Design a protein around this ligand. Structure first.
Ligand SMILES: [Mg+2]
Ligand SMILES: [Mg+2]
Ligand SMILES: [Zn+2]
Lengths: 87, 150, 81, 186, 129
RNA sequence: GUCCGAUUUUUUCGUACUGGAUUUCCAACGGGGCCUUUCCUUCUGGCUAACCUUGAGUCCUUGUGGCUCUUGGCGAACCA
């Protein structure tokens, strides 16, 4: 939220779910954030550097949390031949 | 859902995506049209014609392969019945039940059903009135109806 | 579930759904070419025939109607087109 | 008389007469390839660039005919795509479109549905591929604001148009303003 | 019986965003549906959509993308004297800063930002935010 | 450019008003037009083709009326 002179007001811009793009409430204590390790030349997980996601309370409570990750994984290329678009 | 019952059945015919076809028919409209009127003179209603054409003579449905709906064929050939087949089979039924209603006067379930059928008839007939296929009055009458079947 | 190509449902799931409830509804019945072993005639019947279809003559019998698919008589040929 | 310009139906033009004599040429095969080729005449022809190094010839048929050009076509186009190499040949019946009735653009005595923008453009697309029926159809409305129609072609006898599909689109596009894309089973 | 169609449409779309669904079938397809869907798309509340040709009245598949709150229909389609476009926007839109009521003017179907500008008006269709 | 309280607080350091035309230097926005098979429907006006026609002429491996002048009829089209 901008203001009169393009100055940035509003005291915090919340996260958004990676699978429903819906706001993560300040008290969404089911909301999750998974950091996934990225690798280099064979094994050796590069520390402090992740491919990171965020799932909503809602999705996780629906049991869709896993399946959303598989579609989110392959998409950023973390899996191959797991998630299927057609079913 | 149903009109005169609590039924929600969907038993309906699914028509295929194919305004032309089939690649194996090959008999020309003129020869199937020749066949529709052949059965229509022998005293047959459009419904039970397409029944027989679909079962024995291959023809998937005459609206394609001839480009014209079966009743219009009869129409053009001057073989259109007096009252629409729709109504006839309604009226016929009502005529029936009404007879059974007379030898059986305590059949309260029959009386009730009779009301139903005659409601369908009138609601139907009121439509055929509206689209000029029945003369502006016509009316289903209890007494005279038995004359419209035979 | 949650995300899925509805435009492109799998042919195996699509053939499982109800007749009407396929992406674009379509029939499941077919037609036959049918003949009895003593005659070169080639009678063409429908799978869910409600008529006791005869051969060109010879007061025989090809199929008998039921509640669904008709039952072709005894010894006869048939190819599905 | 003359077997040349009479097989047309207008005074012009070059390309047409060239086809016309390319017609009589094939009419020199009397028993069938003449008996079934003398009644078949056409109206006019358009040229249109395709995406490949070729061009597209649009041969316009009167309409009550059409069914005639359909009894050959396979032959004709093939023999036409022999003599006129580097060309894609398709027969499109010229259909009259009547505008939508308005308080302004008004006309009496109704207006048959088969005389309408939608039904006619829908016929063109059916004529464009002629053989092989159309199995399904979609219209992608795009995130940015414009539509694309996805015509779904058969499996049977597709060999007669595999190569012209890139050409059909161009035809449709100059004809209408809309845009085409093709596909088969999936 | 089936009565609004645009309603059963918007319902389905809404009821999906509600359940975190990223796509909905729609049936049957109406022009009035499509024009509506366009108006939504052009402000990003939906994504791309795709008509389907059953030899009938249509189907539609819509891509949702979160961020849709409620698309609704107002039924009956009331007549709105242009000076009263204000009063509906003040009634069923979340903030003055954003949101859209969309109508049906003789100048076509459009959002109220637009009817405002072309200075036309007419019958309300529904709303998006 | 000049009206006006000039702000963080140092100097040639930074704020409500007006003017701005035509630009390829981007944008959004509305108004009126056309072309794309689409001004249709009615009526009046315009210019007039073609069509018939009187009269005088010419061609033909055929009365085939072709073609040109000419008398007064009829106003496709197109424009308003
Ligand atoms: Mg139902
Ligand atoms: Mg009722
Ligand atoms: Zn037999």
């Amino acid at each position: 939220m901008e203001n009169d002179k393009g100055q940035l007001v509003e005291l915090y811009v919340p996260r958004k779910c990676s699978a429903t793009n819906r706001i993560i409430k300040a008290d969404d204590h089911a909301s999750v954030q998974i950091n996934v390790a990225k690798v280099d030349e064979e094994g050796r997980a590069i520390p402090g550097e992740y491919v990171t996601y965020a799932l909503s309370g809602y999705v996780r409570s629906r049991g869709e949390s896993d399946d959303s990750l598989n579609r989110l994984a392959q998409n950023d290329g973390l899996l191959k031949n797991v998630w299927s678009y057609s079913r | 859902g149903r009109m005169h019952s609590a039924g929600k059945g969907i038993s309906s015919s699914a028509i295929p995506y194919s305004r032309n076809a089939p690649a194996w028919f090959k008999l020309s409209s003129e020869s199937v049209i020749e066949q529709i009127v052949k059965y229509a003179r022998k005293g047959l209603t459009p419904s039970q014609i397409g029944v027989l054409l679909r079962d024995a003579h291959g023809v998937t449905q005459a609206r394609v392969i001839t480009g014209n709906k079966i009743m219009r064929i009869l129409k053009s050939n001057g073989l259109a019945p007096e009252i629409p087949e729709d109504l006839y089979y309604l009226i016929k039924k009502a005529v029936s039940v009404r007879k059974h209603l007379e030898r059986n006067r305590k059949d309260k379930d029959a009386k009730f059903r009779l009301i139903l059928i005659e409601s369908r008839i009138h609601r139907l007939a009121r439509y055929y009135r509206t689209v000029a296929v029945l003369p502006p009055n016509w009316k289903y009458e209890s007494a005279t109806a038995s004359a419209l079947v035979n | 579930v949650l995300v899925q190509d509805l435009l492109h449902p799998t042919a195996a799931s699509e053939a499982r759904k109800h007749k009407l409830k396929t992406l674009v509804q379509g029939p499941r019945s077919y037609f036959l070419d049918v003949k009895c072993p003593g005659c070169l005639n080639i009678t063409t019947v429908f799978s869910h025939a409600q008529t006791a279809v005869t051969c060109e003559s010879c007061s025989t019998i090809l199929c008998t109607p039921t509640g669904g698919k008709a039952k072709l008589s005894e010894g006869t040929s048939f190819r599905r087109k | 008389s003359a077997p040349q310009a009479k097989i047309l139906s207008q005074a012009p033009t070059e390309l047409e007469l060239q086809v016309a004599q390319a017609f009589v040429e094939l009419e020199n095969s009397s028993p069938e390839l003449k008996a079934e080729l003398r009644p078949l005449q056409f109206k006019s022809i358009r040229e249109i660039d395709v995406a490949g190094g070729k061009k597209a010839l649009a041969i316009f048929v009167p309409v009550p005919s059409l069914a005639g050009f359909h009894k050959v076509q396979t032959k004709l186009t093939r023999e036409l795509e022999k003599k006129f190499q580097d060309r894609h040949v398709i027969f499109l019946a010229e259909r009259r479109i009547l505008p939508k009735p308005s308080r302004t653009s008004r006309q009496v005595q109704k207006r048959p549905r088969s005389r309408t923008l939608t039904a006619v453009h829908d016929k063109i697309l059916e004529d464009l591929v002629f053989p092989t029926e159309i199995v399904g159809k979609r219209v992608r409305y795009l995130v940015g604001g414009n539509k694309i129609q996805k015509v779904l072609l058969d499996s049977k006898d597709v060999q007669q148009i595999d190569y012209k599909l890139e050409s059909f689109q161009a035809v449709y596009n100059k004809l209408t303003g809309k845009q085409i894309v093709f596909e088969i089973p999936s | 019986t089936r009565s609004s169609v645009l309603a059963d449409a918007l319902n389905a779309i809404n009821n999906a965003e509600k359940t975190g669904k990223r796509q909905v079938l729609i049936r049957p397809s109406s022009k009035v549906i499509i024009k509506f869907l366009q108006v939504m798309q052009k402000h990003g509340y939906i994504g791309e959509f795709e008509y389907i040709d059953d030899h009938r009245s249509g189907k539609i598949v819509v891509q949702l993308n979160g961020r849709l709150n409620k698309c609704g229909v107002i039924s009956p389609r009331f007549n709105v004297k242009i000076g009263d476009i204000e009063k509906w926007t003040a009634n069923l839109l979340p903030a003055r800063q954003f949101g859209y009521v969309i109508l049906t003017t003789s100048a076509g179907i459009m959002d109220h930002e637009e009817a405002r500008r072309k200075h036309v008006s007419g019958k309300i269709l529904g709303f998006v935010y």
